[PDB]
Amino acid sequence: PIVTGTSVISMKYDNGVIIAADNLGSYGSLLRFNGVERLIPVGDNTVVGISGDISDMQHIERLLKDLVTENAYDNPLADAEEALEPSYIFEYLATVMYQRRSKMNPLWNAIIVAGVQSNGDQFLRYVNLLGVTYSSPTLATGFGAHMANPLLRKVVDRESDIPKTTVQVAEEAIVNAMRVLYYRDARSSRNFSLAIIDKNTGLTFKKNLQV
Amino acid sequence: DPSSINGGIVVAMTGKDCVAIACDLRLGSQSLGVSNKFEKIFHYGHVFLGITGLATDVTTLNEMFRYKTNLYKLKEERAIEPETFTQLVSSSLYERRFGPYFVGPVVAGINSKSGKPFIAGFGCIDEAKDFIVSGTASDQLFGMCESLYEPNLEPEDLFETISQALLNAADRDALSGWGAVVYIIKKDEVVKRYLKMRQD
Amino acid sequence: TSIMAVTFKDGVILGADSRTTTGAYIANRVTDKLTRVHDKIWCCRSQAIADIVQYHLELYTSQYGTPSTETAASVFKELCYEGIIVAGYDDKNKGEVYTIPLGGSVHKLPYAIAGSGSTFIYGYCDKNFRENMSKEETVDFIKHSLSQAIKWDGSSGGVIRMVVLTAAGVERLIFYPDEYEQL
Amino acid sequence: TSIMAVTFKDGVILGADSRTTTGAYIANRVTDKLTRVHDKIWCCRSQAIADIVQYHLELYTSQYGTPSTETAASVFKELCYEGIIVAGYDDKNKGEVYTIPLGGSVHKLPYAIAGSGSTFIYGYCDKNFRENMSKEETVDFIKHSLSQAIKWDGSSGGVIRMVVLTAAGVERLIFYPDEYEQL
Amino acid sequence: TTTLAFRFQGGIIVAVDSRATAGNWVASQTVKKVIEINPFLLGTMAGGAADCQFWETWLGSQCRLHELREKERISVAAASKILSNLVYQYKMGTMICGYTRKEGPTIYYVDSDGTRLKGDIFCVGSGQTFAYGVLDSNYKWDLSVEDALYLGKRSILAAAHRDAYSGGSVNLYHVTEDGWIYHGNHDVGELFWKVKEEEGSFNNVIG
Amino acid sequence: TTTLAFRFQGGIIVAVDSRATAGNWVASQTVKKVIEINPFLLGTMAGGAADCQFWETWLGSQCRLHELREKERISVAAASKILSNLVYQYKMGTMICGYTRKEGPTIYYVDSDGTRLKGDIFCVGSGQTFAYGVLDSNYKWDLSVEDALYLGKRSILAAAHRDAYSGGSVNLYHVTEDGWIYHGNHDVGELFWKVKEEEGSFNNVIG
Amino acid sequence: DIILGIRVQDSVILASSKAVTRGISVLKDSDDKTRQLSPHTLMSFAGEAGDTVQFAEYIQANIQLYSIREDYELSPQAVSSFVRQELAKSIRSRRPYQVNVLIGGYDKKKNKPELYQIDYLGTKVELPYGAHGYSGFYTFFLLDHHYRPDMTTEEGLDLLKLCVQELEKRMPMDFKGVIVKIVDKDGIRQVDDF
Amino acid sequence: DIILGIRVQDSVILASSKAVTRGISVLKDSDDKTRQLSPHTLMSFAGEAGDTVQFAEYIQANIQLYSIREDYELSPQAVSSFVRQELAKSIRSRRPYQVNVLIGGYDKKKNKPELYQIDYLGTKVELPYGAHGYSGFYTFFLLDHHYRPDMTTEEGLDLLKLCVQELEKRMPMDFKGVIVKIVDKDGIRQVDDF
Amino acid sequence: TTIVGVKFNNGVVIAADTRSTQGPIVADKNCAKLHRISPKIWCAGAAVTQLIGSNIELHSLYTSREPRVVSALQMLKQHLFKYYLIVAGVDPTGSHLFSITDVGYYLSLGSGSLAAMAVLESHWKQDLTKEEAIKLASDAIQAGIWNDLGSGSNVDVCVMEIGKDAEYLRNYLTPNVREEKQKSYKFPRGTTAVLKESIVNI
Amino acid sequence: NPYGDNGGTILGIAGEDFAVLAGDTRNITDYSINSRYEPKVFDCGDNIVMSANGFAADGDALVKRFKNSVKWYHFDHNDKKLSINSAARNIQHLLYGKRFFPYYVHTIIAGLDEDGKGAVYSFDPVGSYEREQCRAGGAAASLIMPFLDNQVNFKNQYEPGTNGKVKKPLKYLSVEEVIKLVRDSFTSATERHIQVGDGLEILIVTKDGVRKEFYELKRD
């Protein structure tokens, strides 16, 4: 990439998922752009966090809005039990990234799809430019995979720790990790976006949060 | 990598008041097997040393350590101990830090004063209490030893354990085999046994 | 090169230097770097793509009416993605600046700077730029900014060419070294 | 890094950031980059060479008396030639700044800036520096320049450490991000 | 890997080893290195086993199609020619062994370069030199079936002993005019001690 | 370049060409490729002409020093050994030719890799194959002096004709027990026509 | 491979080395590196392992197709021209044939033997004698001396025998002897006792 | 080069190839790649062209100097140890000797033949039979089959003849035969009629 | 490898994991990475240590003074510059913490350096006590152990307090003890085939 | 570089009436842990368990395409159960379809043959396959298979008192005894391989169906 986005960090608590990313687009060692929203809400039950190539990220943003528009075609239940699921969005994105890699024209990004399924299960899965996908109770990209993940894994070490984790604890851990990432990552920013997807209260998008 | 040119493996194990050191006998030139009598285990007094890696390096190091331990015995009027010999091996190896011998040395022995079994791996000393492996099949040896080893084995049980580990690691290594020798080392006696194995 | 576009209270001003170099050789020192892609949409590089964009925008105008600066940047991106500063004036948008760095991403900014000489004025332009500047303040801001960029960048020099895009029309301004160097 | 030394009416002030990075990782964010080579001679890099310079200057002080900043720069050159900013105060010279860029040449300047963040503030420092500034004016100028450099350079950040070298003595000043970022 | 095939009065003897190595790690000691293309055709793998296995299995499909159209089995010359043309157009060593009424016992050697050779004896693999010597010193046309099967066993044993990447076991095949016969898997470790005992060879090996 | 030296009953015949080429450009047609080390020793240059020239002149100086000390001329074996040690310690093809009372006619071949061979026939250079074949087809020990000189001429002529980088002229030397005799420079252009006329060879060349 | 060709007053003689070597071992010691293109035309080939045979049978099939289609035999000159064009096409194709061929034939209309040397690039030339690669380095000296246009077949074979002896002596390889074939007005025949 | 060594009940037999090849031509076909180190020790060598002879004469000079200084003959074991030390020194010098040697000798005190194989790296090993490089690839099958410790010199020579025949058939070069020497209690002698 | 160094109110603590790897293979599961230069100067790296300690001891005998952390730092720096460590200790001038050179109130090196730094950044505060410093360094090492593949096994801790003796807490934590195997793999005697047996005269 | 390493080691053992396919659940990149529970052994229907070890993206694609072909087989053969040998041939054709841009995976499938005996097939990334009694894949294959050969096949073991002339005869290992060996070998591999740990998932194929067992490994 040339203009790049830094880490996206995420975790799942007892009633949903939290995902955060900062609002900065780096140009090498130059901190060039400071209004880059890298959390992409898709519907009301899914947030797509993108890192890496900003131009490829803007391409994925377009692909996600087209996917929402196509789903509503001839679908009277598009705002209903026939809406796009986090698993549907991830599978589409994973297919695109894998097909791009196989054509030697990869979308140079790491994507975390965060959301809650219709049955209430937390969805938190990752995909990168190579098409490598995995899920975990906590996920992070780039720099956060090395520094934010240890702090989040201290809160949710395994799957049985998820029901014991409240939204306040999860959000406090995510904000602490964002502060730590600001201190030790040179390509990071004080300003970050935070999205909470809860199976009960729905999507909560918080913008311009400051370390 | 000159260590894989000749092949061969060395494994050492501690038992109850005893140590065992074992090696394969294959001297190879890449895939070609040259000699089946290249014993990689040497002893200087009551301290045993197994050397894997480049065979010329093995011979050079054996000569150097015979030299140094002979001078040690002449100066000190006592035979060198396994821990002192381990320090000697480490210092000799780091004496050639940028001209290194392509070897993996394994020290086995029992301290004559304390009577405690001693094994060591390597310049940085890995003074393990259970087992030391070295050679081209070090991963196979690690698997076999980690699965088979249990503490405080009697000399017969220790022989069976180290023999099975060596044989089954050598079976899965292309450049190890053509026979094997096991030394069961105790304070009073040292038994040398040649193992029957596949000759391919 | 040192190129900058600044939105102000009545529109947008695109300013650039006039020096093109091949190493240490100044091949052209009267270059016109501000390029018209549509009536009141102008772009600058930090040349074939400008021809295709003008082709596409002319096609858009015949079929879908006057394009906006965003449409020009959209066409620029769809060709670049598959360093450009795009500045333009529209009645409803009242002047917009779009920067498209080398990666192919598009950013809408109150002002943009690009080129080898833009690095030396990142500190200066941040401190001195103000929203809703007057036309003379904006010209002064660009004149002071590019002069510093010209002073420190060996690839920047010559005259400072300016294109003012407002509702009144397109105004071309030229500033010679004897004027801006003494600023 | 962003390091900058300014001669003023009573002496010289050396200012630097406190961030050292290994790529995107900030390994140390409280680094002390201003290094004392002699009593009132300080240097900054843009570490062994500093030790050898201090050795040579201590020898010079023992044998030939107090060295000047020019002597320190000469030793620095003879070691490097066979990016350093050397600042120091002497009674007769009343404060001197010597820059030794990567090539090993020595230049005596009223003020010097070095590091990856100096590029973003070249224009700002050219526009805003004035000879014979007051101590507070000099501190403000360094604060603003280093704040801009930290804002634009990813390798610059942390606290702004300042060493004031005058006839009064050596004064250490620290400025935290909560103070200089809002400037 | 060591594969051999030789022609004698009783047909064709095909002997292979079964060791597959990933570098110095022996992945498997039970790899089948003979493709049973059809009840009358055998192929051998020596390097590029996947290209061999896929195309020699596909070669069986072409023979079956030739069987249905012409009411006659494909020849070894045709089967090797198809495989050689296939290998050339994508430009390993494989032996195509068969015994038809017209040609008789026939062996064709096809390698990755596109070469296609008819012959009486072939050895491919890392141990081919040891196998070649045992064959060259003991091969006869008037050799009996029992003596030919042992000769195939013995030649692989020499290769397995001396070559690090050959071993595991010997798979013996006997191509006759009625079709090939599998003569079993013989562990090299057991075979070596038996041969050392009965033959008196390998005097440098302590037993 | 083509240099040859062969041993016969009358001594040693040394024949060389005289062409030096800088790529495809013929820099000179009159290059001496035989070194008169001393009145009884000859060296030949084939590649690395400067090292050959300097070190064989120095070899002559060493031979003179040995003469002064031991009241006896250095042997061909000793001179070849000195030159070979010198070449090895700095690790071209040169023939050392001489005729001393003890050894008789002696030729040693020394090359750049340090090899040192005694023999009866040697050919070095780009045209060594053609001259070497001519020698192998016509060489005899009982060859007369005139016939041996013609044989050297003919071998160099074949090399010059067929090899692009050999030609110019033939320099003939005859090493006898009384010292070497220079038998002159023979232009390859004239020699070819003379040999074609008298011998009937080169029938594919129109004359 | 080692390929020699020699055109004598009434016939063309071709000699081809017998050895096949792949890597560490000599697989075959009796290979025939020749193909009969027509009853009075023979082509011997040398070069890369799989290219030589593949190109030779492709040429042979084409010449056979012309013969059946026209009920006529192409002249050796026409055959050599066709082979040269095929080699010239290959040298700029996706993967060229690295094949050097000698074409020996008898022109039944001119009643004259013909020998053509064509290299992999497509360089054709009519020669009284020829060899490919390093083969001529050890033979041309002898042919330049003793070849005559009016040589009989026996003298050509004696000259060919002498050429092979020099190759065995001085080449650093072991090509395991040669197979000798003769093309004349009576067709193509092989000399087993060489 | 091709070097074979075989130790029989009372003697050691060494066979060395005769060919010298530099580039395009075989310069010599009768070279002797052996050096007599002592009256009962013989060393045959193979490897890089100029290194082998230089190293061999250096070793021979050193062994002769020891023999003169002590008025005694080094045992074959001691000679092999000295040669191994020299090769091990070379392998890490500024430019190593790329020389592989076989040392065959008769220990007059043990009254036993000895054969030692040392490669360029300095790996020494006592063998009943040995060969360097690719030479053992075409000989080890036959020796593993038919070698016995109690073989007489005639049987060892027959086995060596069979090994050389196999090498001539399957190795892709022409080494121009071998020179055979025998070391026993009576000294070193050469077998011309091999 | 995960090494941390944390300074507290009256000293400095260094901690490390005990895993040694040769590629993806764990060679030593209990390697000691906290190396003593002098009784109160300890080093940890991600032979030079033994030589530096020897020369430090000789220098201390020569000057009849306690070794200084600056002396060890200078020696290591000069030696390494002639041809990555954390050096901590207490000398008459107080407690010191260096990396090879930057000082720090807390440090971390190795493959697990980032996880350990995350824990330190999260939990480090000024004026730590000795117990809190040990807890923080141990937690940083544990984070490196759990999150970095190159770190594992145990935690070794060395505490150097200004007025006290240094205490080396070898295997301070052992959070990776292997569970008991499902079966015992003791072979019956006589399972291995033996070709020859002989007593060795040592 | 379109490829990568995500670790993971898999083990397929064919009993006389059962087949087990076991793999560790740890997903890694370089020296980081991506997930501590990312299963790599999948029940693909028709009592066939599959695992594609190697490049994770190619592993997902191949397993997805095989599950694709099983569905098409049921569509074309009226829900007929796919035999393990038919599945192996199908997987060979899937792998060879990308001969020159291969799936950088070694895949193992396990199940019961048409006679009811345990079957295990291993596949080369290019398409070569072979039926095996046992096969290990992944990085820690060399730390697991030598132990199983010793303990399942009794390699290098002889009957005591026979002077190594009578080998220890082969025996029926129950699936419970095979699970114990699989657990022990994986715990040993966890100790000495940094890419093995966090949990062991074992899929047991019998005539009853496919049974899944999970065991915790060490998390360092």
mmCIF file of N, CA, C and O in Angstrom, chain I residues 87-108:
data_model
loop_
_atom_site.group_PDB
_atom_site.id
_atom_site.type_symbol
_atom_site.label_atom_id
_atom_site.label_comp_id
_atom_site.label_asym_id
_atom_site.label_seq_id
_atom_site.Cartn_x
_atom_site.Cartn_y
_atom_site.Cartn_z
ATOM 1 N N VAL I 87 20.651 -4.368 30.735
ATOM 2 C CA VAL I 87 21.596 -4.391 31.844
ATOM 3 C C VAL I 87 20.991 -3.602 32.992
ATOM 4 O O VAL I 87 20.709 -2.406 32.852
ATOM 5 N N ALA I 88 20.795 -4.270 34.120
ATOM 6 C CA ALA I 88 20.247 -3.657 35.314
ATOM 7 C C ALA I 88 21.155 -3.968 36.489
ATOM 8 O O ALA I 88 21.903 -4.947 36.474
ATOM 9 N N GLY I 89 21.095 -3.122 37.503
ATOM 10 C CA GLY I 89 21.852 -3.387 38.705
ATOM 11 C C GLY I 89 21.734 -2.240 39.677
ATOM 12 O O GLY I 89 21.140 -1.200 39.383
ATOM 13 N N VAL I 90 22.317 -2.451 40.850
ATOM 14 C CA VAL I 90 22.467 -1.413 41.859
ATOM 15 C C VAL I 90 23.952 -1.272 42.161
ATOM 16 O O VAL I 90 24.650 -2.270 42.378
ATOM 17 N N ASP I 91 24.438 -0.042 42.135
ATOM 18 C CA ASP I 91 25.801 0.313 42.498
ATOM 19 C C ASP I 91 25.727 1.412 43.544
ATOM 20 O O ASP I 91 24.635 1.860 43.903
ATOM 21 N N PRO I 92 26.878 1.855 44.095
ATOM 22 C CA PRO I 92 26.838 2.948 45.078
ATOM 23 C C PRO I 92 26.105 4.201 44.617
ATOM 24 O O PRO I 92 25.725 5.032 45.445
ATOM 25 N N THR I 93 25.897 4.356 43.311
ATOM 26 C CA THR I 93 25.173 5.504 42.787
ATOM 27 C C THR I 93 23.683 5.246 42.597
ATOM 28 O O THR I 93 22.975 6.138 42.120
ATOM 29 N N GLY I 94 23.192 4.066 42.951
ATOM 30 C CA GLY I 94 21.776 3.763 42.909
ATOM 31 C C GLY I 94 21.466 2.624 41.960
ATOM 32 O O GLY I 94 22.347 1.876 41.526
ATOM 33 N N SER I 95 20.183 2.494 41.640
ATOM 34 C CA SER I 95 19.724 1.463 40.721
ATOM 35 C C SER I 95 19.700 2.001 39.297
ATOM 36 O O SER I 95 19.432 3.182 39.067
ATOM 37 N N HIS I 96 19.994 1.127 38.340
ATOM 38 C CA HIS I 96 20.113 1.521 36.946
ATOM 39 C C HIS I 96 19.469 0.470 36.057
ATOM 40 O O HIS I 96 19.416 -0.710 36.401
ATOM 41 N N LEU I 97 18.986 0.918 34.902
ATOM 42 C CA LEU I 97 18.366 0.028 33.930
ATOM 43 C C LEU I 97 18.701 0.537 32.539
ATOM 44 O O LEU I 97 18.269 1.628 32.161
ATOM 45 N N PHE I 98 19.457 -0.250 31.781
ATOM 46 C CA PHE I 98 19.910 0.141 30.457
ATOM 47 C C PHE I 98 19.539 -0.927 29.440
ATOM 48 O O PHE I 98 19.323 -2.090 29.788
ATOM 49 N N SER I 99 19.461 -0.517 28.181
ATOM 50 C CA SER I 99 19.344 -1.436 27.061
ATOM 51 C C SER I 99 20.412 -1.115 26.026
ATOM 52 O O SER I 99 20.755 0.047 25.807
ATOM 53 N N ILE I 100 20.941 -2.157 25.395
ATOM 54 C CA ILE I 100 21.934 -1.985 24.342
ATOM 55 C C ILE I 100 21.441 -2.669 23.079
ATOM 56 O O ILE I 100 20.573 -3.539 23.135
ATOM 57 N N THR I 101 22.301 2.949 23.235
ATOM 58 C CA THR I 101 21.944 2.646 24.615
ATOM 59 C C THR I 101 20.933 3.646 25.165
ATOM 60 O O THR I 101 21.153 4.856 25.122
ATOM 61 N N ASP I 102 19.822 3.127 25.685
ATOM 62 C CA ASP I 102 18.762 3.946 26.248
ATOM 63 C C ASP I 102 18.474 3.523 27.681
ATOM 64 O O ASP I 102 18.429 2.332 28.002
ATOM 65 N N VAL I 103 18.289 4.521 28.547
ATOM 66 C CA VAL I 103 17.806 4.245 29.892
ATOM 67 C C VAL I 103 16.288 4.107 29.863
ATOM 68 O O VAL I 103 15.614 4.484 28.899
ATOM 69 N N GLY I 104 15.742 3.552 30.937
ATOM 70 C CA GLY I 104 14.302 3.419 31.018
ATOM 71 C C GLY I 104 13.841 3.058 32.407
ATOM 72 O O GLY I 104 14.565 2.427 33.183
ATOM 73 N N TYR I 105 12.617 3.488 32.720
ATOM 74 C CA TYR I 105 11.941 3.023 33.923
ATOM 75 C C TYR I 105 11.385 1.619 33.738
ATOM 76 O O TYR I 105 11.268 0.867 34.710
ATOM 77 N N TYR I 106 11.035 1.258 32.508
ATOM 78 C CA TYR I 106 10.720 -0.118 32.164
ATOM 79 C C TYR I 106 11.215 -0.388 30.753
ATOM 80 O O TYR I 106 11.290 0.519 29.922
ATOM 81 N N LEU I 107 11.558 -1.646 30.495
ATOM 82 C CA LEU I 107 12.086 -2.067 29.206
ATOM 83 C C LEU I 107 11.571 -3.460 28.882
ATOM 84 O O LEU I 107 11.109 -4.191 29.758
ATOM 85 N N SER I 108 11.649 -3.815 27.603
ATOM 86 C CA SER I 108 11.336 -5.170 27.170
ATOM 87 C C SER I 108 12.046 -5.456 25.856
ATOM 88 O O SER I 108 12.102 -4.592 24.979
#
